[PDB]
Amino acid sequence: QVQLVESGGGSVQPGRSLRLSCEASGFTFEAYAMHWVRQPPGKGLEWVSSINWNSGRIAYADSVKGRFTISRDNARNSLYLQMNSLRLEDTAFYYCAKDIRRFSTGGAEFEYWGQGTLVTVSSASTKGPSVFPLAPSGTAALGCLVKDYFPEPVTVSWNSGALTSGVHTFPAVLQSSGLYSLSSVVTVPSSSLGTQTYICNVNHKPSNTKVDKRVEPKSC
Amino acid sequence: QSVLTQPPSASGTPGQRVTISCSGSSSNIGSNFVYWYQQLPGTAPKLLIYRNNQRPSGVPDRFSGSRSGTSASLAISGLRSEDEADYYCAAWDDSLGGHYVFGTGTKVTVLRTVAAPSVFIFPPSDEQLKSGTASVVCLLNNFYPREAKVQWKVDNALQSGNSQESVTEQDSKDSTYSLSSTLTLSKADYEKHKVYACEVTHQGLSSPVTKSFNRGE
Ligand SMILES: CC(=O)N[C@@H]1[C@@H](O[C@@H]2O[C@H](CO)[C@H](O)[C@H](O[C@]3(C(=O)O)C[C@H](O)[C@@H](NC(C)=O)[C@H]([C@H](O)[C@H](O)CO)O3)[C@H]2O)[C@H](O[C@@H]2O[C@@H](C)[C@@H](O)[C@@H](O)[C@@H]2O)[C@@H](CO)O[C@H]1O
After folding, report:
1. DSSP-assigned beta bridge partners for residue A105
2. Residue B2 falls within a domain, yes or no?
3. With a 6 A CB cut-off, is A171 part of the ligand 1 pocket?
């Protein structure tokens, strides 16, 4: 199975530099042109750069020409994007993509994409979240409140992935303070409350934060 | 600079045939292959159609593409709830020495039957109160359509300016939305009042529904 994993995202100040990487497995990396595509949150797709199998032919979109450098290490099955002189409008998910064709020299055909690394160009300071229980009131609703973090993104799972049904993890909203906040809620049967343990797992990779929060009913 | 234009949105009942335009110029679609990409909410784009009409393995045959001149079109036969996504066409553009152009994208939603939300209300945790701010959360679960009004009342006094909303994307299997609204008060203001109520107006409710709690009970 083809697999592409991007890393190197997180927050970065305007004017500064950031290097993204992509690890490729499940195919003969050194035979396929690789590309970077980016997507500003909520907006559309923009092609960034291309490099063929031996790095002989390289292409850049005009919006990054002169600031970004694409490269690759076939022995390490890795693709790199060096980003200099970053601007707010460079804030985006950056996607690593593999070409359909072997040994091509031009064009682009994005056959498989990595899930992307989110780059936030901002003057704000990185800050990890605080996590509070949304304790439950035969449907009963419980959740976790992930408040006052920056930048995006947060991931939330329930019982380390052993609970998937009824789970709604809402899009983050930017508070007036400049920090983000979201809720993840799951509807379970009330029969389950005294019987089952519900833990929300919050990951905030930009601040290197991992928190597990037991969410129990209230005493009353 | 060069743009492939698509309709901003598209919709259909389950089983309906949806069709998405992609309008280009003689420099891109008129000369080069067209590709279509599908992006489910919160995921990365997928290759859906390549070289005008080819489908990868793992793409159902209800997706098909065609190219006629400077325009291209994607067709989804028998729209399913799992098809709710953004769809982007794309093609190489020969002008200006060469560049790849993505289309402006089309959001595809499923038209289902009106469904009223379920409302749940959450008091702030005691742990958050120890830090001096209170967050009250109102949850509107599994409703359709998307538009909804949340109105906070504190001892029946309507609030304004101290709340924020967030809405999910359309659900992959039942085509509903959910909504969270958060009321943020200082700890001191939170303890000065007793009844916290969130009042919900929606097309599925003939009269507004109110869920509330008394602080400290
Ligand atoms: C060789 C090369 O990279 N030329 C690019 C050019 O890309 C090519 O365009 C033609 C059509 O004009 C064709 O689609 C090429 O694809 C194929 C082929 O049929 O030759 C597809 C095959 O699957 C593939 N074979 C394998 C085993 O993977 C071969 C093969 O990779 C090459 O022939 C070299 O061995 O390629 C395609 O590669 C490129 O054109 C643009 O991009 C294309 C992907 C397509 O969208 C075109 O319509 C579009 O104009 C141009 C860009 O200016 O640059 C040339 O250098």
Report:
1. none
2. no
3. no
- Rounded Cα distance, A175 and B26, in Å: 46
Strand A10-12 relative to strand A117-121, pairing: parallel
- The verdict on residue B1 lying in a domain is no
What is the distance in angstroms between the Cα of A142 and the nearest Cα belonging to chain B? Answer: 9
Could you identify the atom of ligand 1 that is nearest to the CA of residue B98?
53
Experimental method: X-ray
Distance CA B41, CA B174 (A): 15
Asked whether residue B67 falls in the same domain as residue B130, the answer is: no
Q: Is B122 in the pocket of ligand 1 (CB under 6 A)?
A: no
Distance A102 CA to ligand 1 centre (A): 10
Domains along chain A with CATH numbers: 3-121 (2.60.40.10), 130-214 (2.60.40.10)
Q: Which of B80, B110, B140 is the last residue of a domain?
A: B110
Q: Is B50 in the pocket of ligand 1 (CB under 6 A)?
A: no
* Resolution (Å units): 2.4
Give, using CA atoms, the residue closest to atom 28 of ligand 1: A101
Taking CB atoms and an 8 Å cut-off, how many pairs form between chains A and B?
A: 116
Count how many domains chain B has.
2
For residue A104, which atom of ligand 1 is closest to its CA? Answer: 3
Query: Which residue segment(s) compose the domain that B172 sits in?
Result: 118-214
Same domain, yes or no: B78 and B148: no
- Any domain includes B154: yes
CA distance B101 to A46: 8
A114, A97 in Cβ contact below 8 A? yes
Question: Would an 8 Å CB–CB cutoff place B92 in contact with chain A?
Answer: yes
